[PDB]
Amino acid sequence: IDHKADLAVAPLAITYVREKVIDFSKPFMTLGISILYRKPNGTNPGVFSF
Amino acid sequence: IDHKADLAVAPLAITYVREKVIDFSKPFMTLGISILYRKPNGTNPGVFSF
Amino acid sequence: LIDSKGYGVGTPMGSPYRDKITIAILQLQEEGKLHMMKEKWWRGNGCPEEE
Amino acid sequence: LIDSKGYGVGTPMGSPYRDKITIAILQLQEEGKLHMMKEKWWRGNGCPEEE
Amino acid sequence: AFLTVERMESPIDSADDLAKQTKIEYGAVEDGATMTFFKKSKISTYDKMWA
Numbered sequence A, B: 001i002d003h004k005a006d007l008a009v010a011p012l013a014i015t016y017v018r019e020k021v022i023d024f025s026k027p028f029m030t031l032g033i034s035i036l037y038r039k040p041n042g043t044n045p046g047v048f049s050f
Numbered sequence C, D: 001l002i003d004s005k006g007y008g009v010g011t012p013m014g015s016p017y018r019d020k021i022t023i024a025i026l027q028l029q030e031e032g033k034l035h036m037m038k039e040k041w042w043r044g045n046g047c048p049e050e051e
Numbered sequence E: 001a002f003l004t005v006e007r008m009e010s011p012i013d014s015a016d017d018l019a020k021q022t023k024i025e026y027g028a029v030e031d032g033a034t035m036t037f038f039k040k041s042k043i044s045t046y047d048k049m050w051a
């Protein structure tokens, strides 16, 4: 906002709060929230096993 | 190009050919090429499958 | 996904409407009603035909 | 994907380099060179599958 | 067939599936993009996640 930086090439999420202050280019990657869970391995319960 | 309509809201992919001539907003929804394939047929139906 | 080509709204180059529509679309994205609109127009009609 | 947030380069309001940097980004995406650099390091070593 | 093939599959495969269950605790980053998005989401499948 202070013109101290001519560009801000970085992982900046395009958001409304930021857009009212600065100008963003069109996105080069489109990301979003995702679930990170561990890779399933060999396991099973007692009764549901059979 | 000639100002007959000043806001062409429609399914209109963001492209280099268009962006030089026409001016676009942010992507209101992102997509991409995806492969459509029929689900694998299986021999599930049939009460006499045993 | 193979490619990535988002959609948008047309606007003449010498028009200030682009920035305002950008702000409005970002407002819709933050409010999340774009997601429910897409669900209504893509899943809502297809909801009775769920697999 | 749960949300559809987008990245991008930052420019001050009214800066004339935004309209050209978006053109450059779109050209890079169209030629697929953004996808190559997206796969440059995200596939750091690959998935070891033996089974 | 199960012992020969051993097709492992995670209990959760989508956001709503994780929402319905209660054994696996969710996760986020305090004062982060994910947590702020989940707050004020007012979405049916994410309001219970925020709860």
Ligand SMILES: *[C@@H]1O[C@H](CO)[C@@H](O)[C@H](O)[C@H]1NC(C)=O
Binding pocket: A040, A041, A042, A043
């Ligand atoms: C298998 O998965 C279980 C999940 O409860 C985990 O506790 C265990 O460490 C895993 N074993 C491995 C990855 O060898």
Ligand SMILES: *[C@@H]1O[C@H](CO)[C@@H](O)[C@H](O)[C@H]1NC(C)=O
Binding pocket: B039, B040, B041, B042
């Ligand atoms: C499975 O095979 C049949 C017969 O070849 C063909 O109609 C199609 O490929 C599949 N059918 C269904 C219902 O999926």
